[PDB]
Symmetry: C2
């Protein structure tokens, strides 16, 4: 039970558990193509987790045969935004798979995220955001780490994806190998657009230091600290 | 005698040694504004070195009062390119100052460059290039690390500048603090434009691995490896 959807209108529904892997029927995408999913708890164990973005039944990598997701009402999500609404931090110890149509993937958890052997399957871009998504009259305008001092931690087992990767947090402490098509890490207290452009930055009252003690297997790495040890 | 100009037409002339600091009267800039200076040996010790890009006498940071450089013929350089023509690697243990008009600064040495407590004063951008500048009919077209396996090493005393910084080499091994307005590091066997756009990349027969074991005090860091441990 690592993933516990919210009971409200943006809470998705668990549709299967196959060999220990939770399968999440994400909520209907909005007119911008965003499936905005809310959770009281969001954690992935070794068996991984599947996010069902499929209009046809077929074979998943992590959970065997899966069905179409009727919540999609005929249109797959462009962006799967997973948002923790409680005070609970997230632990990611395995792979998150988008089943069906490839999409962008975001996990936001302003309380903290730890990835230790996590990864992302069938995503064009995946982002881990220790911060709040900013919605304005229902539209996603970006993300905020303002006033936040919490940590994105990457453990010794690292992070892997074939797609693009964004790491957004007040501070980042990484101790393992990060494999991605491109790595963009943005630290400090910032506001961001939906595309992770930095729109504003603020000075924290105390230092927010970040540490990258592992390795980076990627052809392009960008690190922006608006408030870096290697 | 850390800096030994070439005897040919692109060799600059030492115009003073003030408190152990060599003062180099760079050669006349060409019509693109490039002062292309060639050296049999290029090394900077603790006292630093000054590159005279001045149309008026005045006070240098490293070498006291200095005169105008008559080689400029009334026009300061836009880019001061220092190029080692021999097989000798370069060691930079102190500051390189542009006296007079601020300019871009490049040191190229395809045999290897080591910076340990080096830095750059009065430069808009400084670049260390373990590679060859590419001139086509007298015009600077960029730089090449093709076929090169040599090392850019940054030691425990680090590198400091208030301007932009580019680090270009087949491999980079850094063990100290790099302070710069922005840091761009490009590793592998590549061809580059004059602005360090990557125009081509090639696969080395054996791995070229890079290491950044120090820290980076900069708001923007980009690392591109076309063939990275932190």
């Amino acid at each position: 039970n690592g993933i516990v959807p919210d009971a409200g209108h943006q809470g998705p529904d668990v549709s299967a558990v196959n060999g220990g892997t939770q399968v999440i029927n994400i909520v209907t995408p909005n007119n911008e193509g965003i499936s905005h999913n809310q959770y009281q708890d969001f954690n992935v164990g070794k068996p991984g987790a599947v996010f069902n973005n499929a209009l046809e039944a077929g074979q998943s990598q992590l959970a065997g045969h899966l069905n179409a997701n009727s919540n999609l009402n005929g249109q797959a999500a462009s962006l799967i935004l997973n948002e923790v609404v409680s005070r609970n931090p997230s632990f990611l110890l395995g792979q998150a798979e988008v089943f069906g149509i490839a999409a962008e993937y975001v996990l936001s958890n302003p309380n903290g995220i730890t990835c230790d052997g996590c990864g992302f399957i069938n995503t064009s871009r995946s982002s881990l955001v220790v911060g709040n998504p900013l919605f304005e009259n229902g539209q996603l305008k970006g993300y905020s780490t303002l006033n936040n001092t919490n940590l994105l931690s990457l453990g010794k087992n690292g992070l892997n994806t074939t797609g693009l990767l964004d790491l957004i947090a007040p501070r980042i402490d990484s101790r393992g190998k990060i494999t991605a098509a491109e790595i963009s890490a943005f630290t400090g207290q910032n506001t961001f657009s939906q595309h992770f452009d930095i729109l504003s930055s603020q000075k924290p009252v105390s230092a927010l230091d970040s540490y990258f003690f592992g390795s980076m297997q990627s052809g392009r790495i960008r690190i922006i600290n608006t408030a870096v040890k290697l």
